[PDB]
Every structure is written in C-alpha cells, then in structure tokens.
Design a protein around this ligand. Structure first.
Ligand code: MG
Ligand code: MG
Ligand code: MG
Ligand code: MG
Ligand code: MG
Ligand code: MG
Ligand code: MG
Ligand code: MG
Ligand code: MG
Ligand code: MG
Ligand code: MG
Ligand code: MG
Ligand code: MG
Ligand code: MG
Ligand code: MG
Ligand code: MG
Ligand code: MG
Ligand code: MG
Ligand code: MG
Ligand code: MG
Ligand code: MG
Ligand code: MG
Ligand code: MG
Ligand code: MG
Ligand code: MG
Ligand code: MG
Ligand code: MG
Ligand code: MG
Ligand code: MG
Ligand code: MG
Ligand code: MG
Ligand code: MG
Ligand code: MG
Ligand code: MG
Ligand code: MG
Ligand code: MG
Ligand code: MG
Ligand code: MG
Ligand code: MG
Ligand code: MG
Ligand code: MG
Ligand code: MG
Ligand code: MG
Ligand code: MG
Ligand code: MG
Ligand code: MG
Ligand code: MG
Ligand code: MG
Ligand code: MG
Ligand code: MG
Ligand code: MG
Ligand code: MG
Ligand code: MG
Ligand code: MG
Ligand code: MG
Ligand code: MG
Ligand code: MG
Ligand code: MG
Ligand code: MG
Ligand code: MG
Ligand code: MG
Ligand code: MG
Ligand code: MG
Ligand code: MG
Ligand code: MG
Ligand code: MG
Ligand code: MG
Ligand code: MG
Ligand code: MG
Ligand code: MG
Ligand code: MG
Ligand code: MG
Ligand code: MG
Ligand code: MG
Ligand code: MG
Ligand code: MG
Ligand code: MG
Ligand code: MG
Ligand code: MG
Ligand code: MG
Ligand code: MG
Ligand code: MG
Ligand code: MG
Ligand code: MG
Ligand code: MG
Ligand code: MG
Ligand code: MG
Ligand code: MG
Ligand code: MG
Ligand code: MG
Ligand code: MG
Ligand code: MG
Ligand code: MG
Ligand code: MG
Ligand code: MG
Ligand code: MG
Ligand code: MG
Ligand code: MG
Ligand code: MG
Ligand code: MG
Ligand code: MG
Ligand code: MG
Ligand code: MG
Ligand code: MG
Ligand code: MG
Ligand code: MG
Ligand code: MG
Ligand code: MG
Ligand code: MG
Ligand code: MG
Lengths: 54, 119, 123
RNA sequence: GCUCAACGGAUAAAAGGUACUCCGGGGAUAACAGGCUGAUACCGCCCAAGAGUUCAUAUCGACGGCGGUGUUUGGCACCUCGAUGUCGGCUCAUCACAUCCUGGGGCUGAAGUAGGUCCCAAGGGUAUGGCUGUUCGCCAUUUAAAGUGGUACGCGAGCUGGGUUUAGAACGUCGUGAGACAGUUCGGUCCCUAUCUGCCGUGGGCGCUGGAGAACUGAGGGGGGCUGCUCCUAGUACGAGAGGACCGGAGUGGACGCAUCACUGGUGUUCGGGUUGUCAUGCCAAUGGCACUGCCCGGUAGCUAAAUGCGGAAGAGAUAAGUGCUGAAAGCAUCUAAGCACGAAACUUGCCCCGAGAUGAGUUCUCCCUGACCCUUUAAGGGUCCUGAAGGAACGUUGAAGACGACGACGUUGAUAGGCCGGGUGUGUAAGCGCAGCGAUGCGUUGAGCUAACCGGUACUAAUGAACCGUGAGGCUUAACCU
RNA sequence: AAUUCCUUGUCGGGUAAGUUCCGACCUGCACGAAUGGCGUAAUGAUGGCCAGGCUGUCUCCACCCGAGACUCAGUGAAAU
RNA sequence: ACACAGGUGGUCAGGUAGAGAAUACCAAGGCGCUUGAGAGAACUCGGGUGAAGGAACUAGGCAAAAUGGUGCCGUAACUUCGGGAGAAGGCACGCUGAUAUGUAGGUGAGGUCCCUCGCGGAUGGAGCUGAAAUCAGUCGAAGAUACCAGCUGGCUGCAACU
RNA sequence: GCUCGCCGGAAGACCAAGGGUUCCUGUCCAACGUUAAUCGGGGCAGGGUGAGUCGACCCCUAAGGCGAGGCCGAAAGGCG
RNA sequence: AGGACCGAACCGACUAAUGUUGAAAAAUUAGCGGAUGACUUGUGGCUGGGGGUGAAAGGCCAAUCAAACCGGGAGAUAGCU
C-alpha cells in the first residue's frame, strides 16, 4: 500500500473524467400559480397540481 | 441476501425502531400533517393507518389495544372520537406524501405527510 | 448418519453395551452411514462375561439412527438412540442371538435376512 | 650484550568474555535462495561370467564402458549486507511425466484366476486418525489409488509462532572466572487502507458512416470427463481337482458440481404465549418500558443442506504402441517403398456457458423523416425561421434485479409498491361480564383473540399536462437491370 | 530424569494405534550429600498426561440483530 | 501537544427486593457524549440461536459452552492431626389457606405499689413489628426462574507456603 | 414545550490540590469548535470574590534544613 | 486466633480477541490474583553519576540506562562511506 512513482496530470484527469455531474434536465410548471418547481415536488409557495396545502 | 423481505432497518436498532415510531405516530394524529424525511414517512404509513383501521370499529378492548400501541390517554380518546368516523367509508389510505425538497445542514430529503382531511 | 467417533448403544445380547465407531467402509472420503451399512467398531464397555471382551475390533451395522430413515412418501422415521448390531469380520452376520428393540423395514435383503426374524418389531 | 624466532627488529612490559551490547563500513566475505558446472544422488542404455531342471535374455545380472536429468550431499563467492522473513502446518493451485489408479496392445518360466516386466498413454482422481515442533517415519484402519518432482525446498503487503532465534532461569559438562555448548527443557509483541502490472465481477463515451427498437449466425474461448460393487451370460469355458473368467448387458451407492424449497429440518431480536425483579400509566384489574430479544417455549415467507431432481455419456473423424491385407527392392519371406483395413479416458468434435470493440467490426425482418433560403468555405462548407417524429434519457411507484451503476415491471387507457375487505398460516380460550370457592384458579360465551413478507381481490393514497435530446433522403469510385 | 549422546534404549499398564505420561530394570557417554541427597500433608493466574460433564474448536458451516466498509451532503489527512 | 474511550487524595449516602457500598429498575438530580441522511453486497469487529455426532480440531479443550445461592442427609486414599472439603454425589424451594382471623420472638403504652426521687424501680400487657416450620390446595414445559452466582475427579516434575 | 432513552455509589450534590476569568449580562460569526452554526469555555465591552467565629499568619513542635561561638578540611567549605 | 478462606472499594496485571500513521508513544470490553497484612495511599523531608537505591531482572533514577541530563576542551580523532 505504497506507491513507487509520482503519476501525472494526464492520469489524474483520466480518472477525473467520469465525474460528469449534470444539472436538472428540465423543470416543470404549475397550473394555478405558475412557477418552475421541480418535477414531482412541491413549490416554495406550497402548490402542487392545483392545491394550496400550507 | 434480502429477497422477498419487508420492513426497513433505518440505521437504528429495534428498541429504537418502535420507540421512535411511537412519537411519530403520537404527533401525526395530533397535528394531521408533519414534515419528516422520506424513508421515515413512506414507512410511517402502515404504522399509523392500521391504527386507524382498528379504531374504525369502536369497542372496549380496542381502547386497550391502541393504548398498547400508543400509551397516550389523549391520543386514544381523539383517535376514537374524531378521527374514527371521519374516514368511515374508504378502504384505507388515510395518508398522503408530498415531497418538499431537501434540508439545510445534512441534505436530508424531506417530505410532508398528511391526512386527507384538512378542509 | 453415523460418522467416526460416534458412541453407539448395542442392540443385541453379545455383551457389549457401549461401542465407538472408528471408520465407515465402502467408498473413499465417506462421511455418513445410516441403516444397511457396515461400519467398523471397537468395544468399550462389555458386561462381566460375554462373547466379546474389551478392546476387540470388529465390524457392525447401524440399525437405529436418531437422524431417522426417509421413506418414499417423504415420511421420516426417527428413534431416540443411536444403536447398532454387532457382526463378524469373516462372516458378515452376527455374534449374539437375540436382538432387542425394533429395527427398520429398509434393511431386509439376503445379505441381512437374519436380523429380521429375531427382531420383535420390523418397523 | 638483544631464540628481538611474529627472524626489516612497534614498548624496557600484556590474556579473555559479550545472547545486555553500540559505531563506521562490506555482497571484496559466510548462512537462505538463485547462476555456472555435474564430482556424489537418481533414471535410462552396452559387452554378458553365470543364476534360472534344458536355456544369457520371462526376471535378475558379476569384473568393466558411456551418457541423460539438475533432484540430494557437495564445490566456486558472481546479484544480494543504505536488509531480498527462513522449517512445518492451515487456504488456494498450475504445469512437468521417469504414470499410483483407470484406457489399448506385445513377451512370460502366461491354462483360468491373479501377477511378473518393459512399450503407447498426464483427460480425470489421489485416507481420515495415534505419537512427537516436524516433511518423512512407525503403527491402527480403508480405497480403484493412497504417485514422483520443480514453482525463493509455491504461497507471513493472506493466517498461525510450536520448532531454530533476543533479553530471564536451571541441569549435565568445560573454564579459576566473565560465560559459552545443532545438549536439554519452562516462559517469551509477527506492523500496511493498493499508486501501477496482474485477476474475478459490474459499467459510461465513442466507432461500427443515414439514426433508433429487437431477435440472431458464430472464428475464438471456457468450465465437463472419475470410479466401486451386486445381479444376468454362468458356476459356461479353462482346469485333475481346488478354483473361476473374457465379451457384452441391468441395478444401487460415495467423493466433486449444477440448480431449486414441494416434502424433513435449521435460523425466523418485525408474528402469539409463559415468566421473574422493579418503577411509572391516580388506583384494582389491564398493558408497556428496561436488565445480552431479561430467561425461555413455539413460528409464517425468504435465505439455506444434512433435505431431492440432473449431470460425467452414446456416436463420428484422423491418430500413438500393435496386429494386419497385397507386394517388389533382393524372382523367395517382408505392415511399406505404391496403396488398402483396424486401433484408447489423450486429439478435433459431440454435451453445455459468456459469446460481432471478429476494426476480417457481420447477418437479419421491421417503424419514422419527401421544408424555404440566402452567405464564400463554390459544396462532404457557416447561419435565421415553421420543423423536434421514430426512439431513448430524466423524474415518481418499485421488484424472487441490486455495493453505486446496470437489468425488469407499472406510469390514470393502469394493479408497480404501501393501504383495505374475505381467506390462509402461526400461537393457543384474549379483555369484559355471571357462576364456584378461604384464595391461588377453573368453568361458559370460546378454537376465541391477535396476525411479518404469503395466494387470489378493491382505485381510498401515491405514481402530473408538459418540457428536455435525437432531424429533413445519407459521401465518393466502379459494376449490373431498367426507363 | 529439568541431567541419557548412540535412542522412539528394554519391559509392562494406559490407546484400535501412544517419539510425550505413569511403574520397574542400570550398560549412569557425564546424579550424589548444606553451589546439598531422597522423601512428603497443604498451596501455586506453575511444567507434562488421561477421564466424566459441555458445546461451532472441528467433519460442514447456515441464518439472524447491531457498529463499520458501498451511495448522497458538509469538513478533509498521512507513508511514499 | 487533542474540548483525549487514560490518571489523580478527602466529605454526604433515598426507595423495592437483597447477607451487602455486589447486582437489576428507580426518585432527588443530571445527559443523549459537536457530523449526518440513506441502501440492507463480499469481508471484518462485537453478539444471540442450531438438526446428527461430541475434541476426530490443533503444538496444546486456545477460545467458546457448562457449573454456579441458601437449608438438610452425606464425604475417599493421604497427613505435619489442623487439614484433604464447598471432596464426590443427592433431596426439597412460586403464589394461596389453616395451624396462628399475625405464632415463638423483638419492642412497649396505660393500671397499681413503695419511694434512698429522678431523665424513677418493679408487677403489668394495650398497640406496633415480625421470622422460621408443618399440613392441605393450585398454575406452567420449566419455581436459586431475570441480574449477580465455584467445572469436577485420577498419577506425577519443581518449589514448603503468604 | 412535551413523547422516548442513559447514569443514579455516578456521568448526583461539595472542598482541600492545581489552573487563573474559563463565572454571570449585553453584542459578533471572519479564525477557533473535527460538520452546519444565530450557540459557546470562542472575539469585544461591562458588572461579580463583603468574616471577631470559616480557611493562611499567629503560641508550640515531629522528620529534617540552617546554624553565634566551636571542631576539622587547600580555598571553596564539611559537620555540629 | 490468623503472614486464614469466598468476595465489592483499593492495589496488581495471567490468557485470548480488538489494535498496531489507533480513542492511549502500553489502553478498552469479557474473564483473573491479593484483598487486617512482608499490605495499599495523601502529604512533607533524606541519598546522588563510577555514585545513589535494589524481597536482585543490570532493574529503575523526569516517555532516556552495562554508566543519565546540560554547558565547556571540541571544529575530540577517523587509513572508513
Ligand atoms: Mg527501489
Ligand atoms: Mg415485497
Ligand atoms: Mg615483520
Ligand atoms: Mg619484516
Ligand atoms: Mg614489525
Ligand atoms: Mg621496544
Ligand atoms: Mg541469559
Ligand atoms: Mg543478564
Ligand atoms: Mg551496527
Ligand atoms: Mg555499501
Ligand atoms: Mg561480492
Ligand atoms: Mg546449503
Ligand atoms: Mg548458497
Ligand atoms: Mg541449486
Ligand atoms: Mg549439462
Ligand atoms: Mg526410454
Ligand atoms: Mg529358453
Ligand atoms: Mg531386464
Ligand atoms: Mg540473486
Ligand atoms: Mg534498498
Ligand atoms: Mg540479507
Ligand atoms: Mg512413458
Ligand atoms: Mg505386463
Ligand atoms: Mg492433463
Ligand atoms: Mg493430473
Ligand atoms: Mg477429450
Ligand atoms: Mg489431524
Ligand atoms: Mg499426543
Ligand atoms: Mg503422516
Ligand atoms: Mg526447491
Ligand atoms: Mg529445489
Ligand atoms: Mg516441495
Ligand atoms: Mg518456502
Ligand atoms: Mg508473501
Ligand atoms: Mg509458511
Ligand atoms: Mg517460541
Ligand atoms: Mg483505489
Ligand atoms: Mg482499483
Ligand atoms: Mg455498454
Ligand atoms: Mg475444447
Ligand atoms: Mg424449506
Ligand atoms: Mg411454500
Ligand atoms: Mg427464536
Ligand atoms: Mg414490570
Ligand atoms: Mg397490577
Ligand atoms: Mg425506563
Ligand atoms: Mg433492551
Ligand atoms: Mg419448528
Ligand atoms: Mg422456513
Ligand atoms: Mg478411421
Ligand atoms: Mg514376397
Ligand atoms: Mg509379408
Ligand atoms: Mg469414462
Ligand atoms: Mg469420446
Ligand atoms: Mg386491478
Ligand atoms: Mg394496494
Ligand atoms: Mg385478511
Ligand atoms: Mg392455531
Ligand atoms: Mg395476551
Ligand atoms: Mg378470558
Ligand atoms: Mg369448552
Ligand atoms: Mg385464536
Ligand atoms: Mg397481491
Ligand atoms: Mg521428567
Ligand atoms: Mg545427563
Ligand atoms: Mg536426547
Ligand atoms: Mg509403551
Ligand atoms: Mg519412570
Ligand atoms: Mg548438581
Ligand atoms: Mg559442596
Ligand atoms: Mg503466589
Ligand atoms: Mg487423546
Ligand atoms: Mg464508531
Ligand atoms: Mg467511509
Ligand atoms: Mg464524500
Ligand atoms: Mg465533545
Ligand atoms: Mg461524538
Ligand atoms: Mg451514520
Ligand atoms: Mg449485513
Ligand atoms: Mg449460543
Ligand atoms: Mg450443534
Ligand atoms: Mg432447539
Ligand atoms: Mg488430535
Ligand atoms: Mg477456557
Ligand atoms: Mg461464557
Ligand atoms: Mg512458589
Ligand atoms: Mg436506568
Ligand atoms: Mg453498584
Ligand atoms: Mg471566554
Ligand atoms: Mg457571553
Ligand atoms: Mg467554524
Ligand atoms: Mg458557520
Ligand atoms: Mg460562560
Ligand atoms: Mg465567550
Ligand atoms: Mg459583619
Ligand atoms: Mg478557626
Ligand atoms: Mg530536628
Ligand atoms: Mg550546620
Ligand atoms: Mg559559621
Ligand atoms: Mg507492579
Ligand atoms: Mg505478562
Ligand atoms: Mg479489565
Ligand atoms: Mg479474597
Ligand atoms: Mg485473605
Ligand atoms: Mg558517570
Ligand atoms: Mg526510564
Ligand atoms: Mg563511562
Ligand atoms: Mg585537545
Ligand atoms: Mg567533528
Ligand atoms: Mg579532527
């Protein structure tokens, strides 16, 4: 469990290649208050598909 | 391996996984909607709703059985006076989960669990 | 299901009442013997005087296992003591002449037609 | 005058121990393993006195001769001292063939049975214990067999530390002693997350030159091959008797593997009950908490093996040793030179598995796009607009799929999970009431009550209208039918 | 024998089998009388051996509940 | 050297069991130990259970399992007379009722007598507390039920022992 | 605030040791805190330690230190 | 009566598993021994590097021992890397 050389930035990036975080693909919109909340999630207001919960 | 099993361990032991769900089921029937995380509220489902399906059919012995389930003199009287007859027609499903994003200090994916009746 | 170092009761009249298996016979790396097998036993505790003394080495046959025998229909037959019947190294047929206890039906064959006449209950 | 004799002569003068040790160095120089000869070791050959009733050759071989293998004991001191952990066990192997078993053939001083001995054959298989620290060894007992070797006398960044090995102690023996002694008992810290090569698994991007949904052909690869015994033929042949088969058939078991859980069981801190000790729910009853589920008894589905189903094949081809057929060289004998036939677990197949990243990138039936343009990149080129379909990704419900990915089912047209009614299954007459009694307690309603995953059911809850990505006839050359 | 090399000396119990153990022989390589001989009730976190009880030590490992190891969020080392 | 599973002398001592400052649950009182939320793999640490056999494991019963308290009967060779000895092995134990509507025992108030006198000395028995045993009767698979709580025996080597 | 848990011969209530504002009251989150952080034992500022009887000095000593003169050492000094 | 027995405080540290850039540069959890005596412990004072102390292992004497720690000769000397 001890290395014998110092590897390079090339190998460091070649490992770091697969760190590809993607963002949210698209958001989704209400039908009585109209904001861009997450898909299958409540709004910050408290709306979900028409209802105003609290 | 876990094949065909049930239940959820939830990173607590089993003197904990009944003593927590006592307090959670002692708060949900009290306030009819609370804010708690998603695996703790997808499986609080079948801990609170058979407690209401039992309370649908009033007796004397069920006032000891749900007293064993809850150990709260307030909640047994409210569960058998108000929340009994108000759902006396459905075939179950007295709950509803609504996802409310995430949480501040730990990125805990929360949820809103509720009864169907607030209006 | 008799392996090595199994301490058996002796079913018959031939003086021994506590034996100890040392081998199972009939195939390499063998582990288990039920009814119908020929294990090899020493003799650990005889009576005051009998046909065989202490320290003899002679073959036997397991006749009553606590693991039980398994019929065609799936039904099991279990006992309450691991016990065997003594034998003879040059004749493969016993030394004593009276067999106590019951023995099982799945032992009868013309190698062993002599322990099915004396036994009071062919189970 | 100086046996300075260690004789170019250090002083007029000098012995040991360190396993309590420390330092500078040293692979110049030892042990461990390599590398180099190959003297000893082992195994094949050559002459053939004799032994074997006759007879060197069935089996042995004197006095001598020549090599092979690198395998023991050794020789040299090269790599290695600013360190490569050493014997034996445990766990995993792989190759070698001088082959232990099993397969096929010739010889015999081979009647049969069982053997002797070389020749071909390495696919597969190869004992559990007693004893010492032990490989071995001896002994007890099986089996078809308990092979021989290299791999740092395989394997301590995988594991015991008993052996030899540090510090303590003692006995024998040696020295006056300090302490030593392949002599001995007794107790004696074994460190490390994997960067890279390697290996078993699971995956994203791109290419496969229009793009997507699937099913496949298979050049190569990889696991697999074992064997006992009883019964028929047949107590036949052979044999004086005693004994006792070839060659083919029928059954049942062990070791090793593949699955699955219906039967027999194992677990079942999520399902019933009994029970102690203590504190609380105001209290009596009734339930819950804590002391390893407090101690137990039972136990559903799943996971599992000791539980029960299947496998090892049969066949085809050319083959190794050997027996042949025809037949010259050499008019005759000759398996060989021409040719023709047989031949075994080794070989290729046959059984099965992942298998087009086979770049030699495939085969294959399907479904979708048939719009306008201007700019210099003059055409395989850059951009503005209606176009954004096939289909996949993402999100939610999740699973006999699972580390995370990935694979699979469902997405209001729908049972994908959680719920709920009726059932099943497990525990074993719940609480409450009335009777009996001094009371523990029984009896009735009562096989009642509770019920985890389990088989068939119900839209009450959760799975959102969309949005996001993928485009508009496919490049060039050469050949062939056709308008 | 804690001292014995030839050695697993020699015999008998113990075991199916016993290079260790207990009992005798003496050919003691090289015990031996206050660097002590032999013996002995009790005692020892002492050396060596057998027996009953007990069981995953093991033939043969299967399941279960918990703290880690795998995923996501914040802080974020070390040998080389 | 860390807001360290380390160490440091004295004082106080509640309940229900209990021989007791052991142990199990508690009140007075204090804390949830300064990272979390998930999925339910190999493997490892700490643990509970196990069919048939029961030391075949190994250097070795290492580890693990088991025994385990009070009362009574009983107890070997050997010996320095003490020991060995808790040798070994066994038997009863929960609650209820009676003997006794709470006994044997402990404590002790009134009532009365003299009085060398005061914080009296005796007769006296109210009331409180309360063992231990015997006999009937009853529930479970199991009555020291949980926690604590010795494995036993047989020959030797060394050293008297603490 | 109220459900649950853990110690209860301690992890409850105090002092002699030793540290030296860590104590209370406002205010701040940059470093400190193994995370977040409005909270703090952290940064700043302000308050807080009242004795005839309780602890130190104080009268007297134990081990032992110093020790006028005194004895003995080269000086240092060593005892007493 | 005990240099007595079983056993908590207290003192010690026999075996095994954890862990050996760990919570600790020697501990933790389940077991262990002594536990009115040759014991254990808070305070103070005494001894000193060829010397102190030792129920004796070359042990221990400020995480250092077959001759401690600090300053000086000293930039000790080195045929050796
Ligand atoms: Mg290097
Ligand atoms: Mg399921
Ligand atoms: Mg000279
Ligand atoms: Mg000279
Ligand atoms: Mg000279
Ligand atoms: Mg001279
Ligand atoms: Mg020594
Ligand atoms: Mg020494
Ligand atoms: Mg050195
Ligand atoms: Mg060098
Ligand atoms: Mg060299
Ligand atoms: Mg050598
Ligand atoms: Mg060498
Ligand atoms: Mg060599
Ligand atoms: Mg050669
Ligand atoms: Mg040859
Ligand atoms: Mg001849
Ligand atoms: Mg020959
Ligand atoms: Mg080398
Ligand atoms: Mg090096
Ligand atoms: Mg070396
Ligand atoms: Mg050959
Ligand atoms: Mg032959
Ligand atoms: Mg092969
Ligand atoms: Mg082979
Ligand atoms: Mg083949
Ligand atoms: Mg063995
Ligand atoms: Mg032995
Ligand atoms: Mg052997
Ligand atoms: Mg070798
Ligand atoms: Mg070799
Ligand atoms: Mg070898
Ligand atoms: Mg080796
Ligand atoms: Mg290695
Ligand atoms: Mg090894
Ligand atoms: Mg050793
Ligand atoms: Mg890595
Ligand atoms: Mg890797
Ligand atoms: Mg892929
Ligand atoms: Mg092949
Ligand atoms: Mg099953
Ligand atoms: Mg089933
Ligand atoms: Mg169970
Ligand atoms: Mg209770
Ligand atoms: Mg009660
Ligand atoms: Mg509690
Ligand atoms: Mg608990
Ligand atoms: Mg069962
Ligand atoms: Mg089952
Ligand atoms: Mg052919
Ligand atoms: Mg011819
Ligand atoms: Mg011919
Ligand atoms: Mg075959
Ligand atoms: Mg074949
Ligand atoms: Mg449906
Ligand atoms: Mg449903
Ligand atoms: Mg139902
Ligand atoms: Mg039932
Ligand atoms: Mg009940
Ligand atoms: Mg009832
Ligand atoms: Mg009835
Ligand atoms: Mg029932
Ligand atoms: Mg269903
Ligand atoms: Mg001896
Ligand atoms: Mg000697
Ligand atoms: Mg010897
Ligand atoms: Mg002997
Ligand atoms: Mg002797
Ligand atoms: Mg002597
Ligand atoms: Mg003398
Ligand atoms: Mg002692
Ligand atoms: Mg033995
Ligand atoms: Mg932890
Ligand atoms: Mg981690
Ligand atoms: Mg992270
Ligand atoms: Mg802290
Ligand atoms: Mg913490
Ligand atoms: Mg966590
Ligand atoms: Mg797990
Ligand atoms: Mg257990
Ligand atoms: Mg078992
Ligand atoms: Mg059981
Ligand atoms: Mg053994
Ligand atoms: Mg033990
Ligand atoms: Mg135990
Ligand atoms: Mg002693
Ligand atoms: Mg508690
Ligand atoms: Mg206590
Ligand atoms: Mg401060
Ligand atoms: Mg402040
Ligand atoms: Mg901070
Ligand atoms: Mg902050
Ligand atoms: Mg403060
Ligand atoms: Mg502050
Ligand atoms: Mg005043
Ligand atoms: Mg005073
Ligand atoms: Mg004085
Ligand atoms: Mg003085
Ligand atoms: Mg003076
Ligand atoms: Mg000590
Ligand atoms: Mg020690
Ligand atoms: Mg301890
Ligand atoms: Mg004691
Ligand atoms: Mg004592
Ligand atoms: Mg000195
Ligand atoms: Mg020191
Ligand atoms: Mg010196
Ligand atoms: Mg000088
Ligand atoms: Mg210098
Ligand atoms: Mg110099």
């Amino acid at each position: 469990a001890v290395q014998q050389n110092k590897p390079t930035r090339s190998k460091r990036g070649m490992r770091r290649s697969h760190d590809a975080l993607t963002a949210v693909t698209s958001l989704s919109v209400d039908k009585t208050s109209g904001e861009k909340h997450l898909r299958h999630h409540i709004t910050a207001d408290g709306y979900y598909r028409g209802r105003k919960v609290i | 391996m876990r094949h065909r099993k049930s239940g959820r361990q939830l990173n607590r032991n089993s003197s904990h996984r009944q003593a927590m769900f006592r307090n959670m089921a002692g708060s949900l029937v009290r306030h009819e909607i609370i804010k708690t995380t998603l695996p703790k509220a997808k499986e609080l489902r079948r801990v609170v709703e058979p407690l209401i399906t039992l309370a649908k059919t009033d007796s004397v012995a069920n006032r000891r059985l749900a007293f064993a389930r809850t150990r709260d003199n307030e909640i047994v009287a409210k569960l058998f006076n108000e929340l009994g007859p108000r759902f006396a027609s459905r075939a179950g499903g007295y709950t509803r989960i609504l996802k409310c994003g995430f949480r501040a200090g730990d990125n805990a994916p929360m949820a809103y669990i509720e009864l169907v009746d607030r209006s | 299901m008799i392996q090595e170092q199994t301490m058996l009761n002796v079913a018959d009249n031939s003086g021994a009442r506590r034996v100890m298996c040392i081998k199972v016979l009939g195939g390499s790396h063998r582990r288990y013997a039920g009814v119908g097998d020929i294990i090899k036993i020493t003799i650990k505790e005889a009576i005051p005087r009998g046909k065989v003394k202490k320290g003899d080495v002679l073959k036997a046959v397991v006749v009553r296992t606590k693991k039980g025998v398994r019929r065609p229909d799936g039904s099991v037959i279990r006992f309450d003591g691991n016990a065997c019947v003594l034998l003879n190294n040059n004749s493969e047929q016993p030394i004593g002449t009276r067999i106590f206890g019951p023995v099982t039906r799945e032992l009868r064959s013309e190698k062993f037609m002599k322990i099915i006449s004396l036994a009071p209950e062919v189970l």
